[PDB]
Amino acid sequence: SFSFYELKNVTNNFDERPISVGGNKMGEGGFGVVYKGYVNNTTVAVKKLAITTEEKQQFDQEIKVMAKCQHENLVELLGFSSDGDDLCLVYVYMPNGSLLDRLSCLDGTPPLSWHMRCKIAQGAANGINFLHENHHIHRDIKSANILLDEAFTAKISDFGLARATVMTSRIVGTTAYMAPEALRGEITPKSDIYSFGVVLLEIITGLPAVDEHREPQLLLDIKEEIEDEEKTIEDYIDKKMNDADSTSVEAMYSVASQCLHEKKNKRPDIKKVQQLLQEMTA
Numbered sequence: 001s002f003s004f005y006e007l008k009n010v011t012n013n014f015d016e017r018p019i020s021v022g023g024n025k026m027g028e029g030g031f032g033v034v035y036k037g038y039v040n041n042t043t044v045a046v047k048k049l050a051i052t053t054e055e056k057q058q059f060d061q062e063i064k065v066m067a068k069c070q071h072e073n074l075v076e077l078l079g080f081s082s083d084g085d086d087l088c089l090v091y092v093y094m095p096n097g098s099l100l101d102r103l104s105c106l107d108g109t110p111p112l113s114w115h116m117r118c119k120i121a122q123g124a125a126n127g128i129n130f131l132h133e134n135h136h137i138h139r140d141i142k143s144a145n146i147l148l149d150e151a152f153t154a155k156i157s158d159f160g161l162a163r164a165t166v167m168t169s170r171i172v173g174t175t176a177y178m179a180p181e182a183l184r185g186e187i188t189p190k191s192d193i194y195s196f197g198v199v200l201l202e203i204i205t206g207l208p209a210v211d212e213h214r215e216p217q218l219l220l221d222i223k224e225e226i227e228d229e230e231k232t233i234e235d236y237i238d239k240k241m242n243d244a245d246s247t248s249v250e251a252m253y254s255v256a257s258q259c260l261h262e263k264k265n266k267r268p269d270i271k272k273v274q275q276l277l278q279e280m281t282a
């Protein structure tokens with residue numbers, strides 16, 4: 001447990017400037033802003049939450065799922081702070097930031113090699129598999145919620161939407177990653193698989209999941225382009241790599257394609273996805 005005074009103190013008073021300019025801001029999600037902190041001889045990440053105020057519930061839920069789900073491919077939650085002006089979650093610092101940022105080479109980081117893209121996709125599937133085995137649905141699988149430590153091990157983060165077939169009157173998620181049935185209110189782990197297909201296309205292409213100036217705007221729509229023979233896989237392979245063999249890139253694309261089936265019951269389950277990603281680099 002942490003106090004707002006101490007989290008405030010170790011974040012330079014929640015300095016909103018980017019790290020490069022001298023502040024503490026590392027990024028921001030839909031629901032908060034993430035700051036670097038240095039507390040008790042340890043670098044940490046501190047998310048200050050910031051949707052109706054009752055919609056506090058997320059803070060509450062994030063703590064319960066972290067208690068249950070601990071795994072090599074899941075971010076570790078260090079502590080929290082409910083006292084003070086805002087609420088705050090403290091996590092183990094992830095030295096290579098998010099997969100989203102490393103795919104865009106944000107702040108000058110080197111492009112991820114194909115070999116490391118392959119290991120990261122396997123690691124992220126392992127984290128999803130752990131969640132579904134423990135009867136959890138993440139509901140916000142995306143490359144911004146896959147973080148990378150100093151070994152480039154993938155760790156799933158941001159459990160504020162996770163849940164323990166069923167409809168909800170409160171649809172949540174990130175639209176550019178969301179399966180059709182999840183957009184329409186369904187709660188199923190089959191939807192996490194769909195979102196993971198989009199993440200696999202980010203990893204293949206280096207492109208963001210949505211781009212209003214791009215044709216097509218939604219990355220998941222390049223699957224139909226390739227199927228229609230309007231483009232090839234090769235047209236979309238990230239050029240910022242020189243170790244991407246054709247065979248294994250097409251193999252991961254095929255995985256991404258099966259994940260992106262419109263009909264949830266035609267999608268592979270996470271165990272099949274794990275097996276196929278394993279076979280890719282075997």
Ligand SMILES: CC(C)Oc1nc2nn([C@]34CO[C@](C)(C3)C4)cc2cc1C(=O)Nc1cccn([C@H]2C[C@H]2F)c1=O
Binds near residue numbers: 094097
């Ligand atoms: C993605 C962004 C928000 O976080 C980070 N960006 C970073 N960039 N760099 C560098 C180093 O060299 C560079 C050139 C790349 C800058 C290091 C980073 C560490 C973090 C971090 O540890 N971030 C989280 C840890 C734990 C959890 N969560 C999420 C729940 C939310 F809080 C995190 O976000």
